[PDB]
Enzyme design. Structure first.
Site, short mmCIF file in Angstrom:
data_model
loop_
_atom_site.label_atom_id
_atom_site.label_comp_id
_atom_site.label_asym_id
_atom_site.label_seq_id
_atom_site.Cartn_x
_atom_site.Cartn_y
_atom_site.Cartn_z
N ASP A 154 56.55 40.97 28.16
CA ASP A 154 57.77 41.71 27.82
C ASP A 154 59.00 40.83 27.65
OD1 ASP A 154 59.00 44.35 27.34
OD2 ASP A 154 59.52 44.58 29.40
N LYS A 156 62.22 39.53 26.20
CA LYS A 156 63.35 40.06 25.44
C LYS A 156 64.65 39.80 26.20
CE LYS A 156 62.97 44.76 27.19
NZ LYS A 156 62.67 46.10 26.73
N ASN A 159 65.40 41.23 29.90
CA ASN A 159 64.62 40.79 31.05
C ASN A 159 64.90 39.35 31.46
OD1 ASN A 159 63.51 43.35 30.67
ND2 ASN A 159 61.64 42.58 29.76
N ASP A 172 61.56 41.44 35.48
CA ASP A 172 60.72 42.47 34.88
C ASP A 172 59.31 42.04 34.52
OD1 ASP A 172 63.71 43.31 33.95
OD2 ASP A 172 62.47 45.05 34.24
N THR A 189 57.64 45.69 24.10
CA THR A 189 58.74 46.37 23.42
C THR A 189 58.52 46.20 21.91
OG1 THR A 189 60.25 46.12 25.27
CG2 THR A 189 61.28 46.15 23.09
C1 LIG Z 1 71.05 43.65 41.03
C2 LIG Z 1 71.19 43.39 39.51
C3 LIG Z 1 70.70 41.97 39.13
C4 LIG Z 1 71.29 41.50 37.80
C5 LIG Z 1 69.21 41.88 39.10
C6 LIG Z 1 68.43 42.71 38.27
C7 LIG Z 1 67.02 42.62 38.24
C8 LIG Z 1 66.26 43.30 37.27
O1 LIG Z 1 65.03 43.18 37.17
N1 LIG Z 1 66.95 44.17 36.53
C9 LIG Z 1 66.43 44.79 35.31
C10 LIG Z 1 67.25 44.21 34.16
N2 LIG Z 1 66.50 44.34 32.92
C11 LIG Z 1 66.33 45.59 32.18
C12 LIG Z 1 65.64 46.67 33.00
C13 LIG Z 1 66.53 47.17 34.13
C14 LIG Z 1 66.38 46.34 35.42
O2 LIG Z 1 65.11 46.61 36.04
C15 LIG Z 1 64.94 47.97 36.54
O3 LIG Z 1 65.92 48.67 36.79
C16 LIG Z 1 63.69 48.59 36.49
C17 LIG Z 1 62.74 48.20 35.55
C18 LIG Z 1 61.49 48.82 35.50
C19 LIG Z 1 61.14 49.82 36.41
C20 LIG Z 1 59.90 50.47 36.33
O4 LIG Z 1 59.88 51.71 36.43
C21 LIG Z 1 58.69 49.80 36.10
C22 LIG Z 1 57.90 50.30 35.06
C23 LIG Z 1 56.60 49.82 34.83
O5 LIG Z 1 55.80 50.38 33.75
C24 LIG Z 1 56.36 51.01 32.62
C25 LIG Z 1 56.06 48.83 35.64
C26 LIG Z 1 56.83 48.31 36.67
C27 LIG Z 1 58.12 48.81 36.91
O6 LIG Z 1 58.87 48.30 38.03
C28 LIG Z 1 62.08 50.21 37.36
C29 LIG Z 1 63.34 49.60 37.41
C30 LIG Z 1 66.42 41.67 39.08
C31 LIG Z 1 67.18 40.83 39.90
C32 LIG Z 1 68.57 40.94 39.92
O7 LIG Z 1 69.35 40.11 40.80
#
Ligand SMILES: CC[C@H](C)c1cc(C(=O)N[C@@H]2CNCCC[C@H]2OC(=O)c2ccc(C(=O)c3cc(OC)ccc3O)cc2)ccc1O
EC number: 2.7.11.11
Length: 338
Positions: A154, A156, A159, A172, A189
């Protein structure tokens, strides 16, 4: 060369952690939530603070009932298991993991600088030296992860997180998997999907080098090579290739991108014989000192400015909902590892 010693050493550390995973290294009561800062299919990343230390962390919260219903149990467990097992300079470090009656929790390192997506969108497009600095860190990241038989799937701007020093921290790993050979899952994506994923072939690590080709183009152009309104039209453009380059692109960028955005799997850079060295030894990377960028000795072309104090100004706004943990244990048999 001598880099194989390092990779041997990394295989040893990963496999010991991969075979005997860290389970339940903290609990929820040990943190204060401050702000919801991310969103995904089954949860959210939240900025938290450790009561006893005082250190801020990111804390992904995933609810078991939605993971099972959507059927993504394997992905969720893959993510946790790779994260506690890996260790690399450009990866976001999983500091703690745990679960309870309703959710799964991954307390990661706080990267104060935000996504690469925001910064790219702010300045329009990166300079080819600026895109190079980032791409170099992702080439070394994928060298490490592909040594460990891990595929990322993934890549992009969203992430990739820019830390204080302007260096990338890859996060991610939801779609990340450990596989020797091929996988058949529709992961990624749309704009980044390699043609073999779109055509539902059994694909391998070359998918991550196609994704690197799309990302470098997007960093230097300010937009992806394959774009459209409906995902079906983006998929038609990818299987043909036909990557029309911006006129401001140098000949060295155009050649590297034609090799990474090579629709024929067996002729794509990073996948053919020489491996990662076809990319490391490219003319667009001639000025990159691959060891100095690893050791983070290279001067960053962009120090991403911040609020100052660990969470002061703040960034993006999300609806703050309850971290609800029910009386009874939900889907616990399915997630016995966490
Ligand atoms: C504190 C902020 C800082 C910058 C901070 C952010 C992240 C981080 O990973 N943030 C990402 C930034 N990138 C875009 C996505 C949104 C967000 O990640 C999430 O909110 C998130 C992503 C996926 C899932 C999820 O549901 C998921 C889905 C899957 O299959 C579809 C598999 C696994 C999953 O976990 C849940 C939450 C990590 C460390 C950090 O210090």
């Amino acid at each position: 060369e001598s880099v194989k010693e390092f990779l041997a050493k990394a295989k040893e550390d990963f496999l010991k952690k991969w075979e005997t995973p860290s389970q339940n290294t903290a609990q929820l009561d040990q943190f204060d939530r401050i702000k919801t800062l991310g969103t995904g299919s089954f949860g959210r990343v939240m900025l938290v603070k450790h009561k006893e230390s005082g250190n801020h962390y990111a804390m992904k919260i995933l609810d078991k009932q939605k993971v099972v219903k959507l059927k993504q149990i394997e992905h969720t467990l893959n993510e946790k298991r790779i994260l506690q097992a890996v260790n690399f300079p450009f990866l976001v470090k999983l500091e703690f993991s745990f679960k309870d009656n309703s959710n799964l929790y991954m307390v990661m390192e706080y990267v104060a600088g935000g996504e690469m997506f925001s910064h790219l969108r702010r300045i329009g497009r990166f300079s080819e030296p600026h895109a190079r600095f980032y791409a170099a860190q992702i080439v070394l990241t994928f060298e490490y992860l592909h040594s460990l038989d891990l595929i990322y799937r993934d890549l992009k701007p969203e992430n990739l997180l820019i830390d204080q020093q302007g260096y990338i921290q890859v996060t991610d790993f939801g779609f990340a998997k450990r596989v020797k050979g091929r996988t058949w899952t529709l992961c990624g994506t749309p704009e980044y999907l390699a043609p073999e994923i779109i055509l539902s072939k059994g694909y391998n690590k070359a998918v991550d080098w196609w994704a690197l080709g799309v990302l470098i183009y997007e960093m230097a152009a300010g937009y992806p090579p394959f774009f459209a309104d409906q995902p079906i039209q983006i998929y038609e453009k990818i299987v043909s290739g036909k990557v029309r380059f911006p006129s401001h692109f140098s000949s060295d960028l155009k050649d590297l991108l034609r090799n990474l955005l090579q629709v024929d799997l067996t002729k794509r850079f990073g996948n053919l014989k020489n491996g990662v060295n076809d990319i490391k030894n490219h003319k667009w990377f001639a000025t990159t000192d691959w060891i100095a960028i690893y050791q983070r000795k290279v001067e960053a072309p962009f120090i991403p400015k911040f609020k100052g104090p660990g969470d002061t100004s703040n960034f993006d706004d999300y609806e703050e909902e309850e971290i609800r943990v029910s009386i009874n244990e939900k889907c616990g048999k399915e997630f016995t590892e966490f």
